[PDB]
Every structure is written in structure tokens, then in C-alpha cells.
Design a protein around this ligand. Structure first.
Ligand SMILES: CCCCCCCCCCCCCCCCCC(=O)OC[C@H](COP(=O)([O-])OCC(O)COP(=O)([O-])OC[C@@H](COC(=O)CCCCCCCCCCCCCCCCC)OC(=O)CCCCCCCCCCCCCCCCC)OC(=O)CCCCCCCCCCCCCCCCC
Ligand SMILES: CCCCCCCCCCCCCCCCCC(=O)OC[C@H](COP(=O)([O-])OCC(O)COP(=O)([O-])OC[C@@H](COC(=O)CCCCCCCCCCCCCCCCC)OC(=O)CCCCCCCCCCCCCCCCC)OC(=O)CCCCCCCCCCCCCCCCC
Ligand SMILES: CCCCCCCC/C=C\CCCCCCCC(=O)O[C@H](COC(=O)CCCCCCCCCCC)COP(=O)(O)OCCN
Ligand code: HEM
Ligand SMILES: CCCCCCCCCCCCO[C@@H]1O[C@H](CO)[C@@H](O[C@H]2O[C@H](CO)[C@@H](O)[C@H](O)[C@H]2O)[C@H](O)[C@H]1O
Ligand SMILES: CC1=NC2=C(COCC2)C(=O)[C@@H]1c1ccc(Oc2ccc(OC(F)(F)F)cc2)cc1
Lengths: 32, 440, 54, 98, 27, 414, 39, 54
């Protein structure tokens, strides 16, 4: 199935402000 | 006798609660028919990588025999009553529900209660439903709307449970254990996270009694939902061999509870939906639609505001010729831009009226209303009177549409999904530069 | 097929001055555009020569 | 009378000498384009022809025999009905968008 | 369609009703 | 909170019901379906369905679309073989504006040459989309196979006519079939005095007006779908005959479709009949169509291409069982409960009720409350059901199929 | 009605008029402190 | 053709020394020029329109 596409890990390229998969990125949106 | 007034007269929704915590809600009318069901805060969002698709697997087994009515006895009883038994799984919600005669409601409620609690889950039936799901997955892979939207979620909430498909990865469907379905049901189907909802000819009192009688054994003794991180991102499955391109695009939305959803739905209604069967064509009210009709930019499109707990997907999906993707994207973004910066009073009045009509006319007959009750208690923690909706819509004006749309759209990063002959689908950077205007 | 219609440079010249659909009935008053072009070329050449000496 | 002047003017104008009717000479903006586009086969081909004729005469610096000139009395406004309605429609969409 | 489950409910028993609209897709 | 019904001198039925709901919904129903086309104007009613926002005497093409959208509106047009129905929904405060539109579109369309010309390719689009659902193939052919005249006509214009329906033809169709005599003005969420008023002034269209002859036939469509659709029908009974109710019950005995998601259909004669031998993707359902002056009854299969012989036979046999006696009261009780339940559910909505009330207004001339209907369903004898089944097996057959028909039988192969 | 219910370019063209004023004054070179206020 | 002749006149005037009568011929020619372009030929267009029943 297509349902077994998972999006690769981007941890390496992410801004530190957007690393936490359990936090809103909207907190940091004005900053970024 | 006006619309205003009519709103006041709409029947009251009633809610009560058992000691185990299960809520019971109902709307009463003078119909001979009814609809009644169990809504559950469970779905793919509550699943880990390991158990993803369990909610879905359970839905295949939901109606295939209880301990009390083994094998096909369940469906036999339903068929012979003339009653209608259905189910569904979202990322956040599960529902089972029966449409029947008002006269059979007590028996209906008994059947529901039997389904959710004493679901037999036989080893040999599980093996049957295994291949069924596998094949359903095959069929899904040939629905481009399905695939693109799944993708939108996959990239939009990458690295979370919101990224997960409802149906689960093929790996999990092949491996998911009877034990695992047990874990899942035991963990999630718990009374404070369930609602018994119903509409038609019925007495709220009587529903509540029946609830107490059949459901009270249900446990209420915590899986709560981590925030889900949204990410500006693009997923592109280029497959030139398909004959039309599907694109879905969305910004992070507010989530179920926020009052912005009203103003946002006004704005969405301004922009609208279009299909090449739509009679309106060039004369249509929406600029997106008139332009898309006039210039054959696409077959179809819809705006959406998908709502989850404390997040969402706000945007649009279009299907179009392999050569119109860019032109489509340009006009669409131009619409968002226009609403953010310059939305007119008149068109907002129109958007109001669309959403007004949508809400009234959607809630028609027993099933839509039963769902509204059920989901509402899961999402807003209560049912929202029609007359309340109306006074929140009445609040919205030009300024409000501008102001709210800017919050979510203007200079924010979208999530993008395309599938098909998407060779021309604008580069992500170009898409992002399209989320603001140098002139403003 | 035919060079005048294909070649990137010839195409332009063809489209501009050979196969351009002109009205049947333009008068002598439509001569002036071409003539202005000539005037312009004329000045540049004569000009260039003068400027080798001035 | 007014009509005495109008008739003199018509002959002065002189489009009649090429076998054109008044409506043939209207400058084509978007409204006019559309009115033409709504013309029925008869009326459209007729116009096509009258203009072919006039253009070919313009080329030759020639006119028709007087016998063949478009008569003031016989010149029907073939286009007005089509055009009046194209314009009514436009005015409507304008109104609406305010 | 690749399974009885999905296939079922296709067998027709409605003589057909064509419906086309102004601002709702045809069916 | 009661349905009010009146008939004018001139034959126009009016039904309303003030339910004081926030939404109002008006239908103008018309004996103007595809059956009323002849071999010369085939497809005209299709174009006419597609044409509802063309310019009228009263409002421009622009004004219809903008005006209705202004207020959150909906204008919509449905056809069967026998009727057409123009429906407007809105908020109750604006029915005035929508009635104005409804009356324009039905009472005074202009069908201008250029607009009609322009709408022509839509015929192909709407048709092309429709024919995506392969049920439409089979069912339209089926009607064509079964009849020689009216009910034979498809609802979607035939190809040879796309481009070629004229203004004059549209005009004739409206002038000849949209007459006071052949209309029903139905109204949920509005006052009946006001509907009478409207209809008296605005629907005063002077009455400007063959039995469908079932012959029986067979139409095959070769492609390579690898799933074969087939319908097999015999002449049935017209609406309003008690025979009609007999067939309806037989339909629900044999099984007309699923009551459970992912259902096994333990209770469907047909389904279990096929499934006792063929254990792979298939679907089967009783087909029942009842019209003014005729009806089709039978079953529809969707089978593997290779299996169609085996499936169609298995299905036909099941009906022969009923016809030769084998029907318990358990079974017929189940059937009636289904039909009774399904009827009441089909009128749960605004949509469904309006369609029922308008439907009946044309077909009889009256309203039958749901209670009376249920009595008529209860009033059917197991003997009547066995008779209906008998009627099918013995009656002259019409068939239509489509798919890879290699192993699909002809009628005369039983 | 709907144009006039525009006039949302009035506060944006206010900010563009200051860009035009301040822009011509920068490119061309007293009562602004520090910058040129102290030649 | 009035405008054309006027421009011939404006040219004559411009080649002449600033004395009577040329000062006044020039003033008139200057008025006539702008008058023709901004008022007279617009008007004429319109008069012609009325002469043609549009
Ligand atoms: C290596 C050489 C280096 C030298 C370079 C020097 C260049 C100039 C230096 C000064 C820079 C200051 C910036 C001021 C910009 C003011 C913006 C403004 O309000 O404009 C209104 C206008 C529209 O405003 P909007 O509200 O965003 O609305 C979007 C529209 O709906 C339409 O949306 P859209 O999706 O079409 O928008 C995409 C956007 C993006 O499209 C672009 O225009 C991007 C292309 C940039 C090219 C410059 C890069 C230079 C590097 C070398 C490569 C050459 C590129 C092209 C050079 C042109 C000449 C050879 O284009 C537009 O905005 C659309 C309008 C089309 C006109 C612009 C295109 C003309 C080409 C040149 C533009 C002017 C540049 C100066 C040229 C002079 C000297 C070179 O924006 C622009 O013109 C941009
Ligand atoms: C009271 C005593 C004192 C006297 C003062 C008071 C004044 C009273 C009398 C009124 C005078 C003012 C009114 C003007 C004249 C009346 C109306 C009139 O002209 O009717 C013609 C009238 C116009 O015909 P249409 O069909 O109504 O309309 C014409 C079409 O639009 C297009 O026609 P097409 O497409 O068939 O093409 C042919 C056309 C082509 O027309 C054009 O393209 C216009 C210009 C080009 C001329 C023609 C091509 C030849 C090339 C000429 C240059 C080459 C070098 C020669 C030396 C130049 C001379 C200085 O040729 C003509 O129409 C010839 C008219 C040219 C007039 C030029 C005005 C002279 C300028 C004087 C400025 C004032 C300052 C003086 C200072 C001196 C210089 C430093 O028709 C005819 O006569 C038939 C036309 C065919 C020509 C017939 C045979 C003539 C041969 C033509 C070649 C030579 C032309 C002479 C050029 C230069 C001479 C100095
Ligand atoms: C020989 C020396 C030249 C120096 C000065 C020359 C003087 C000429 C003066 C004036 C011309 C006025 C118009 C300039 C338009 C420049 C293009 C422009 O505005 O692009 C900007 C960003 O620049 C982008 O293109 C985005 C990427 C970043 C590139 C910088 C801007 C491009 C040109 C400037 C370089 C000096 C906006 O474009 P996008 O980001 O694509 O978003 C627009 C869509 N909403
Ligand atoms: C529109 C194109 C041109 C026009 C209208 C033009 C016009 C003139 C005029 C009026 C003069 C004065 C002539 C005189 O009375 O002596 C002149 C002189 C001159 N021009 Fe040009 N010129 C043009 C193009 C050029 C070019 C392209 C060049 C050189 C590259 C050039 C070089 C000269 C030189 C050197 C003189 C001085 C010699 C002389 O007076 O004849 N001109 N030009
Ligand atoms: C006609 C009246 C009888 C007595 C005069 C008879 C002479 C013929 C009439 C013109 C008289 C000359 O008197 C006048 O002189 C002035 C000065 O140069 C010129 O006229 C001009 O004066 C100045 C020139 O700097 C301008 O501002 C003015 O707008 C303009 O009219 C004219 O030439 C003439 O209007
Ligand atoms: C194109 C064109 N369309 C039309 C007409 C007449 O009306 C119809 C359209 C023309 O008369 C012409 C034309 C224009 C110039 C020309 O000869 C040249 C070319 C080039 C040139 O040097 C320059 F610097 F300009 F490039 C100097 C003269 C020949 C023909």
C-alpha cells in the first residue's frame, strides 16, 4: 500500500526551534 | 415567522452521564425512525508505529459476531429488523451506529452495546479480515484523492501520530495480533471517552435508561494526545502515467475548539468548490471558480478546514490537466492573498450565507444529527445550538475575515502534496513566495 | 520541413517581414514606418563615418 | 429639419459609396466583438462580404456605381439589437460587483 | 475493486435518476 | 404541522407543510422525463436539465447564478424516465427570491441561440461523467432492450445528437410538457395560501397536452472490464397496482442490497444463493422499477467475467424457488419489515420527503400517509409474492450486460 | 458599494507615501536628530 | 487639415522675429492648436455620432 510511505527524518536539517515533535512550531514562527 | 425566530424553535439537545462516565445525548422529534450510535475518541492518532491500523482492523471485526450473538447472528438480527448498521474511523474518532424504527430503539441500543463490548474477534475471522484489509489498501492506492490527502497528512505532521494513515502500513496489517487488538480496545474504549447519541422519535429519559442498562459495565478507570508539530514541507509522487494531477495544499489550522473556525469557514465558503459539471461556469460567484471554469484550469477543487485537537489542515485540493497546475496554484494563492488583505463586505455576507445554509441543510434527518451530537461531545465537549452558530456567524465581517485569514495564511509556510503528472507543480520556494504580496 | 518557418532567427524575420498578414489596402501613408527605419540606419552610417573624422 | 442634415451627412461620410452599411463601420471594442459573435449565419457572412468588398475597393482607390450605393433609407441597423443587449448585460455585471 | 466487501452495494435496484445542479456536483 | 394539499381547476397540484424550520425547499415537478422524447428530439430533455441557468425572460444568466449564490442558495434539476423536478433550497427569509428564479426558469426560459450553442459540449461532459458508473451502462441499455418506445429512452443524450439539439427543440419541449395540467408545486417550510397564490398567477401555463410497449430484447456491450455487469428483467407491474407492492416485497425477500457495512447478507436469498458455490468477489441484488404504465422486475449481477454464466444461473434459480412455492413466513416478515423500515427512512429528510410528496402528486393525485402505505405492504399475501416470482420466471425476458462477455449467456441460454 | 468598501489600500498607500517621501529625502540628502542634524 | 495648416503656421511664426503682426498670429495659432486637439475634434467626433443616430 501507499500507506507505508513514511516521510524521512529531517532532524539533521531542522532549525533547533522546530525539533520537538510534540510542540507547536507556531510558538517559534515569528522568531524564525 | 423569520429565520431568526426559526432558530429559537429548533429542538433542544439533551445530555446526561453514567457513573462510569459514559455520556448520553439525544435530540427528540416526532419521527417513526431514529439513528443511534456510540462515538469514541479513538483512532490512528492514538496509535503508535507498532499498533497503527488496529482501530481500522477492529472496524472489520466490529460486526462479525459477539459472544452473545456468535457468527452472523449479529447481522441476521439487524437485517430482519430492517435496521441499518454502519461504522467509520477517522484519525481521532470511531463511530458505530444503527438506523432503525423508533420502535426498535431499545433493541438497537442493546445491539450497539453488544458490538463495542463483547466483540468476539475470532482467530479465524481475523485471518479473513487480514486479506480483506490488504486488498482494500490495493484499491485505495488507485484513489488519487485518497493518496494525496494521506500524503498531505504524512508530510504536514511528519514524525507524529497525525502523520499516520488510518488504515495502517501494510506491514502492520500482516502482523497485527489478536492480542494487539485486545490491548487497543482495552486501552481506548473507555466510558469517559465514549458518547451514546441518538435522534428521532425517542424519549431522552428512555435512551438514558437503556444506556445505564447495557453500557454500565464499560470501564472508566490515560492516553491523552501529545501536541502535533506541523511542518512546512512538500511531498511529490511524480507518476506521469496517471492522466490527471492531484495537488493538496494546507497551512496549519487552529483545531476543533478555536472560534476562528467560524470566520475561516466563512472565508473558505467565499472561495468555494468547483467541478466541471457545475452549471454556474463563468458567471459563478467565486473568482477562483469563474476563472477555473472560464479558462479550463481544472476539473475540480475544494477548500477544506480539517480540524483536530489543537491543530488542523486549512487549504484546498485541486485536480487538473498536467499543464494547468501552475496557473491553478497562482489563482488560488491569489484568492487567499485577496481575503487576507482586502476582503469586501459584500462577499463576506455571501460567505456567511453559504455557511448558514450549509449548517442548516446538513443537519437534516436522523443520521447527520445523531453524528453531530456524538462528534460534538467529543470535540467541543457539548452540542452547539444552531442559534449559537448563527450569532457567531453574524459577528463575522470584512475586517474579521481579513484579520483571521492573515493569522493563518498571510506569510505562513504551507504543506504541499501532489501525485501524478505533476511535472509543472510550482517549486516549493515559489509556492511560499505566493503566501505574501510585496504590494501590502 | 521549411527553414524560414523553423530556424530561431529566420522564424522571427519570416514572421516579421515575409509571411506577416498585412491588410490589402494600406496606402502610401503606411510607407513611413519603413522609411523611418531607413532614416535611422542612414543617420547611423553617415554618423559613424563623420565620427571617424570629427 | 434634423433629418435633412443627417441625410446630407450620410452622403458626405461616403461609406455608402463602398457598399457598406453604417453598422459595418463601427470600431470593434469588446462589446462589438461579442455582438458580431452573436450574429446569425446569414447576417454574419453578409457582413464579411460587404467588408471584403469595401476593402478591395479601398485598395483600388475606387467606388461603386451610384446604382450600387447603400441607400440612406435602406440601411438597417443590423447590429443594434445584438449590441444593445451585450451592453445591457455588461452594465448588469458592473452594477452587481458594487 | 478487489474484494467482495467493497464490490457489494453496486448491484443496482434504483431505476436511474439523473440530477445536475447550480452549485453542487452531478450524480 | 400537517401536509396541506389542493388541486386547481386547471389540474395543477399544490402541496405544502409549514414545519417552521429555518430552511425552505420548493419543488416544481413536471411530467417531462425522457419518456416524452420521440425519435426526433432525443436528448432534448437532457439538454434541458443542463440548461437551468441560461437566460430567462425575467433574469439574466448572470442574475440567476449570482442572485442564488448571494443568499447561500441551491437550484437543481432532476430527471427520471417519467418526471423532471426543479428544486430550490435556501434560508426561509429568501424563498421569495428563489421562487422568482424557479418560476423564471420553468415559466419563461429564452434558450437564446448563442447560449444553447455554448452549452452543447456540456452534454458530452455530463454524459461522460455519468457513464463512468458502469451501472448506468447496463441500466440504460436494459431499458432500451426491454421497451420499444418511451421508457426505452435514455436520460443522457445519444452521441449523435450532441451538438445538434436546437433552441426550437428546447422551446417545443417546454411549451408542450410544462403545462399546468402536468405539474405539482411542492413546498416544505412555507405557507400553503402563499403557494396557492403563486401557482394561480404564475403557473397558469395553458395545457398544451403512447403506452410504453415492452417487447423484450437483449443488449451486450463488449469491453474488457473483467467484471461483468448484467441485469435480467421481466415485465412487472405499474405503480399503484397492489401487484406493485407484491413485487416490492419479493425484491426484499430476494435481497436488494446490504444492511451492514462489510455485511455477509445472511438474510439475502440471492446473495447466499450465489455464494453457495462461487467464493470470490461478486454482488447481486433484486432490481425493481415501477413506472406509470409498466415496470421491470429482476436481478442485477456483478461477477467475475469467467463466472457470469455460473452467477446469473444461480441467481435466476433462486427466483424459480420462490415461484415454485419455497417461501417461509419468517422470510416474508423480514422482507416487509425491511421495505416498511426503508420506506420511512427514505422520507426522514427534507430531500426525501419533498421527492415523495411531489412524486405522488403527479403519479396519483393525492397524498398517502406513511401509515396507509405500511398497511398496503402488510396487506400483501405470501401467495401474492409467490405469484410475482411466478410472473418473472414465466414472463418474456429483457437483458443487458457489459464487460468481457465471453462466458456471459444469451437469454435463450436460460 | 464594494469599491469604497475597498479603500484598504489607503493605510497601505500611507506607508508607501512615507517610503516615497523618506526615499527621495535619502537619495538627495536638518530636523531629523543625529542623521544630517549633525552635518 | 485645420490642425495641419495651423502647424504650418506655427512653423512660419517660429521662424519670424518677435514683432507685429507675428506675435499675435503666433498667439492665435497656439490657441488654435490646443483648441483643436482638446475641444474641437472631440466635439466633432460626437456631432458626427449624432448625425449617424448613435
Ligand atoms: C545578476 C544581475 C543582478 C542585478 C539585478 C538588479 C535588479 C533590481 C534591484 C532592485 C531590487 C529592489 C526590490 C523592489 C521590488 C518592488 C516590489 C513591488 O512592489 O513590485 C510589485 C510586483 C507585484 O507585487 P505582488 O503583490 O507580489 O503581486 C504578485 C503578482 O500577483 C504576480 O505574482 P508572481 O508569482 O508573478 O510573482 C513572482 C515575482 C518574482 O518575479 C520576479 O520578478 C523575479 C525575477 C527577478 C529578476 C532579478 C534578479 C537578477 C539576477 C539575474 C537574473 C536576471 C533576472 C531578470 C532581470 C530582468 C532584466 C534582464 O514576480 C512579480 O512580482 C510579478 C510581476 C512581474 C514583473 C517582474 C518581472 C520582470 C523582470 C525584472 C523585474 C525587476 C527587476 C529589476 C530589473 C533591473 C536590472 C536587472 O512585484 C514584482 O515586480 C516582483
Ligand atoms: C491662390 C494662389 C496661391 C496658392 C496657395 C493656396 C493653395 C490652394 C490650393 C490648395 C493646396 C493644398 C491642398 C493639397 C492639394 C489638394 C488635394 C490633393 O492633393 O489631392 C490628391 C488626392 C488624394 O487622393 P485620395 O485617394 O483622396 O487620398 C490619398 C490617399 O490617402 C493616399 O494616396 P495613394 O495611397 O494612392 O498614394 C499617392 C499619394 C501619396 O501621398 C503621400 O504619400 C503624401 C506625400 C508623398 C507624395 C507622393 C509620392 C511622391 C514622392 C514625393 C517626394 C519625392 C521628391 C520630389 C520633390 C518633392 C517636392 C517639393 O500622392 C498624392 O496624393 C499626392 C499629393 C501630395 C501633396 C504634398 C503636399 C506638398 C507639400 C508643400 C508644403 C508647403 C511648403 C512649401 C515649401 C517647399 C519644399 C522645401 O487624390 C489625387 O490627386 C489622386 C492621388 C494620386 C496622385 C495623382 C498624381 C500626382 C502624383 C503623385 C506624386 C507627386 C506628388 C507631389 C508631392 C510634392 C509636391 C510639392
Ligand atoms: C548592476 C547592479 C544592479 C543593482 C541595482 C539596480 C537598480 C534597478 C532598480 C529597480 C528595479 C525595481 C524592481 C525590482 C524587482 C526585484 C524582484 C523582486 O522584487 O523580487 C522579490 C524578492 O527578490 C527575489 O528575486 C527573491 C530572491 C532574492 C533575490 C534578490 C532580488 C532580485 C534583484 C535585486 C539584486 C540587486 C519578490 O519576489 P518573490 O520573493 O519571488 O515574491 C513575490 C511574489 N509575491
Ligand atoms: C537619429 C539619428 C541622428 C540624427 C537625427 C542626427 C542628427 C544630427 C544633426 C542634425 C547633426 C548636425 C548636422 C549639421 O548640420 O552639421 C548631426 C551631426 C553629427 N552627427 Fe548626427 N544624427 C544622428 C545619428 C548619429 C550617429 C549614430 C552618429 C555617430 C555615431 C552621429 C554623428 C554625428 C557627427 C559626428 C556630427 C558632426 C558632423 C556634422 O555636423 O555633420 N550622428 N547629427
Ligand atoms: C486696431 C486699432 C487701431 C489703432 C492701431 C492700428 C495698428 C494695427 C493694429 C495693431 C496695433 C499694434 O498694437 C499692439 O502692439 C503690441 C506690441 O508689439 C502687439 O501685441 C502684443 O503685445 C505684447 C507683446 O509683447 C503681448 O503681451 C500681447 O499679448 C500682444 O497682443 C501687437 O502688435 C498689437 O496688438
Ligand atoms: C515590419 C513592417 N510591418 C508593416 C509594414 C507596413 O505596414 C504593415 C506592417 C512595414 O513597412 C514594415 C517594415 C518595417 C521596416 C522595413 O525595413 C527596415 C528594416 C529594418 C531597418 O533597421 C532597423 F533598425 F529598424 F532595424 C530599417 C528598415 C520594412 C518593412
Amino acid at each position: 500500500s501507499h500507506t507505508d510511505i513514511k516521510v524521512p527524518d529531517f532532524s539533521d536539517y531542522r532549525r533547533p526551534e522546530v525539533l520537538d515533535s510534540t510542540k507547536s512550531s507556531k510558538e517559534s514562527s515569528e522568531a524564525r | 415567522a423569520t429565520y431568526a425566530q426559526a432558530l429559537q424553535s429548533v429542538p433542544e439537545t439533551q445530555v446526561s452521564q453514567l457513573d462510569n462516565g459514559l455520556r448520553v445525548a439525544s435530540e427528540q422529534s416526532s419521527q417513526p425512525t431514529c439513528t443511534v450510535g456510540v462515538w469514541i475518541d479513538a483512532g490512528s492518532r492514538y496509535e503508535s508505529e507498532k499498533n497503527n491500523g488496529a482501530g481500522y482492523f477492529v472496524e472489520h471485526l466490529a460486526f462479525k459476531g459477539t459472544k452473545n450473538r456468535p457468527g452472523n447472528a449479529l447481522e441476521k438480527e439487524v437485517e430482519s429488523m430492517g435496521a441499518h448498521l454502519n461504522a467509520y474511523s477517522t484519525r481521532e474518532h470511531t463511530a458505530y451506529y444503527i438506523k432503525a424504527l423508533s420502535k426498535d430503539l431499545p433493541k438497537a441500543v442493546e445491539l450497539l452495546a453488544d458490538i463495542v463490548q463483547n466483540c468476539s474477534l475470532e482467530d479465524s475471522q481475523i485471518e479473513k479480515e487480514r486479506d480483506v484489509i490488504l486488498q482494500e489498501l490495493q484499491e485505495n492506492d488507485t484513489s488519487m484523492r485518497d493518496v494525496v490527502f494521506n500524503y498531505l497528512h504524512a508530510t504536514a505532521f511528519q514524525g507524529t501520530p497525525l502523520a499516520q494513515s488510518v488504515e495502517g502500513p501494510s506491514e502492520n496489517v500482516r502482523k497485527l495480533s489478536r492480542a494487539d487488538l485486545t490491548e487497543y480496545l482495552s486501552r481506548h474504549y473507555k466510558a469517559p471517552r465514549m458518547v451514546l447519541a441518538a435522534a428521532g422519535g425517542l424519549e431522552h429519559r428512555q435512551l438514558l435508561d437503556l444506556a445505564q442498562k447495557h453500557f454500565s459495565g464499560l470501564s472508566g478507570t490515560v492516553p491523552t494526545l501529545s501536541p502535533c508539530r506541523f511542518t512546512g514541507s512538500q511531498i511529490c509522487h511524480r507518476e506521469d502515467g496517471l492522466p490527471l494531477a492531484h495537488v493538496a495544499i494546507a497551512v496549519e489550522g487552529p483545531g476543533w475548539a478555536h472560534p476562528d473556525n467560524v470566520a475561516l469557514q466563512v472565508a473558505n465558503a467565499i472561495i468555494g468548490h468547483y467541478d466541471c459539471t457545475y452549471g454556474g461556469g463563468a458567471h459563478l460567484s467565486s473568482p477562483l471558480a469563474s476563472i477555473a471554469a472560464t479558462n479550463k484550469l481544472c476539473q475540480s477543487f475544494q477548500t477544506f478546514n480539517i480540524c483536530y485537537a489543537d491543530t488542523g489542515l486549512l487549504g484546498a485540493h485541486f485536480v487538473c490537466d498536467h499543464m494547468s497546475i501552475d496557473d491553478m496554484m497562482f489563482v488560488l494563492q491569489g484568492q487567499w492573498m485577496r481575503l487576507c488583505t482586502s476582503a469586501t463586505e459584500s462577499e463576506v455576507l455571501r460567505g456567511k450565507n453559504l455557511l448558514r445554509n450549509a449548517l442548516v441543510s446538513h443537519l437534516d434527518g436522523t443520521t447527520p444529527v445523531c453524528e453531530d451530537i456524538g462528534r460534538s461531545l467529543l470535540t467541543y465537549g457539548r452540542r452547539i445550538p444552531l442559534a449559537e452558530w448563527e450569532s457567531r456567524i453574524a459577528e463575522v465581517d470584512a475586517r474579521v475575515v481579513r484579520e483571521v485569514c492573515s493569522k493563518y495564511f498571510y506569510d505562513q509556510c504551507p504543506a504541499v502534496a501532489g501525485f501524478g503528472p505533476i511535472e509543472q507543480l510550482p517549486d516549493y520556494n515559489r509556492i511560499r513566495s505566493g503566501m505574501f504580496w510585496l504590494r501590502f | 520541413t521549411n527553414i524560414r518557418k523553423s530556424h530561431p532567427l529566420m522564424k522571427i524575420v519570416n514572421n516579421a517581414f515575409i509571411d506577416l498578414p498585412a491588410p490589402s489596402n494600406i496606402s502610401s501613408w503606411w510607407n513611413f514606418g519603413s522609411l523611418l527605419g531607413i532614416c535611422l540606419i542612414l543617420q547611423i552610417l553617415t554618423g559613424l563615418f563623420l565620427a571617424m573624422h570629427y | 429639419w434634423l433629418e435633412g442634415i443627417r441625410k446630407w451627412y450620410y452622403n458626405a461620410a461616403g461609406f455608402n459609396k463602398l457598399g457598406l452599411m453604417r453598422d459595418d463601420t463601427i470600431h470593434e471594442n469588446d462589446d462589438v466583438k461579442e455582438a458580431i459573435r452573436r450574429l446569425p449565419e446569414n447576417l454574419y457572412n453578409d457582413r464579411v462580404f460587404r467588408i471584403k468588398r469595401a476593402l478591395d475597393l479601398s485598395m483600388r482607390q475606387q467606388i461603386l456605381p451610384k446604382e450600387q450605393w447603400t441607400k440612406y433609407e435602406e440601411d438597417k441597423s443590423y447590429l443594434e439589437p445584438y449590441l444593445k443587449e451585450v451592453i445591457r448585460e455588461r452594465k448588469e455585471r458592473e452594477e452587481w460587483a458594487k | 475493486v478487489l474484494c467482495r466487501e467493497s464490490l457489494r452495494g453496486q448491484a443496482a435496484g434504483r431505476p436511474l435518476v439523473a440530477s445536475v445542479s447550480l452549485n453542487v456536483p452531478a450524480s | 404541522q400537517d401536509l396541506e394539499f389542493t388541486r386547481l381547476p386547471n389540474g395543477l397540484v399544490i402541496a405544502s407543510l409549514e414545519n417552521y424550520a429555518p430552511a425552505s425547499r420548493i419543488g416544481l415537478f413536471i411530467k417531462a422525463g425522457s419518456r416524452y422524447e420521440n425519435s426526433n428530439n432525443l436528448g432534448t430533455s437532457h439538454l434541458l436539465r443542463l440548461a437551468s441557468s441560461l437566460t430567462t425572460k425575467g433574469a439574466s444568466s448572470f442574475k440567476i447564478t449570482r442572485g442564488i449564490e448571494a443568499v447561500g442558495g441551491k437550484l437543481s434539476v432532476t430527471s427520471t424516465r417519467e418526471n423532471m423536478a426543479y428544486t430550490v433550497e435556501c434560508l426561509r427569509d429568501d424563498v421569495d427570491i428563489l421562487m422568482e428564479f424557479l418560476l423564471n426558469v420553468t415559466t419563461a426560459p429564452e434558450f437564446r441561440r448563442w447560449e444553447v450553442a455554448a452549452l452543447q459540449p456540456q452534454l458530452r461532459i455530463d454524459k461522460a461523467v455519468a457513464l463512468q458508473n458502469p451501472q448506468a451502462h447496463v441500466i440504460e441499455n436494459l431499458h432500451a432492450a426491454a421497451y420499444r418506445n418511451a421508457l426505452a429512452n435514455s436520460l443522457y443524450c445519444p452521441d449523435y445528437r450532441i451538438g445538434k439539439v436546437t433552441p426550437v427543440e428546447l422551446h417545443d419541449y417546454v411549451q408542450n410538457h410544462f403545462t399546468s395540467a402536468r405539474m405539482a408545486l411542492i413546498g416544505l417550510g412555507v405557507s400553503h395560501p402563499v403557494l396557492k397564490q403563486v401557482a394561480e398567477q404564475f403557473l397558469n401555463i395553458r395545457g398544451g397536452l403512447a403506452k410504453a410497449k415492452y417487447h423484450g430484447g437483449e443488449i451486450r456491450e463488449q469491453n474488457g472490464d473483467s467484471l461483468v455487469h448484467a441485469a435480467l428483467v421481466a415485465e412487472s407491474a405499474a405503480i399503484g397496482s397492489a401487484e406493485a407492492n407484491a413485487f416490492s416485497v419479493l425484491q426484499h425477500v430476494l435481497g436488494a442490497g446490504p444492511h451492514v457495512k462489510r455485511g455477509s447478507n445472511a438474510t439475502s436469498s440471492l446473495y447466499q444463493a450465489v455464494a453457495k458455490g462461487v467464493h470470490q468477489p461478486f454482488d447481486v441484488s433484486a432490481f425493481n422499477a415501477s413506472y406509470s404504465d409498466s415496470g421491470l422486475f429482476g436481478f442485477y449481477t456483478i461477477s467475475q467475467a469467467a463466472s457470469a454464466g455460473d452467477v446469473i444461473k444461480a441467481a435466476y434459480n433462486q427466483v424459480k424457488t420462490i415461484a415454485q412455492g419455497n417461501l417461509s413466513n419468517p422470510d416474508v416478515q423480514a422482507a416487509k419489515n425491511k421495505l416498511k423500515a426503508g420506506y420511512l427512512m427514505s422520507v426522514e429528510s427534507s430531500e426525501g420527503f419533498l421527492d415523495e410528496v411531489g412524486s405522488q402528486a403527479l403519479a396519483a393525485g393525492s397524498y398517502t400517509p406513511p401509515s396507509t402505505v405500511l398497511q398496503q405492504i402488510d396487506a400483501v399475501a405470501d401467495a401474492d409474492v409467490i405469484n410475482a416470482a411466478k410472473k418473472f420466471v414465466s414472463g418474456r425476458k429483457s437483458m443487458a450486460a457489459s464487460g468481457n462477455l465471453g462466458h456471459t449467456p444469451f437469454i435463450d441460454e436460460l | 458599494r464594494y469599491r469604497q468598501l475597498a479603500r484598504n489600500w489607503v493605510p497601505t498607500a500611507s506607508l508607501w507615501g512615507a517610503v516615497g517621501a523618506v526615499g527621495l529625502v535619502w537619495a538627495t540628502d536638518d530636523w531629523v536628530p543625529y542623521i544630517n542634524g549633525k552635518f | 487639415w485645420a490642425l495641419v495648416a495651423d502647424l504650418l503656421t506655427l512653423t512660419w511664426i517660429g521662424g519670424q522675429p518677435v514683432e507685429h503682426p507675428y506675435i499675435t498670429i503666433g498667439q492665435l495659432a497656439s490657441v488654435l492648436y490646443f483648441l483643436l486637439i482638446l475641444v474641437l475634434m472631440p466635439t466633432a467626433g460626437t456631432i458626427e455620432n449624432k448625425l449617424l443616430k448613435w
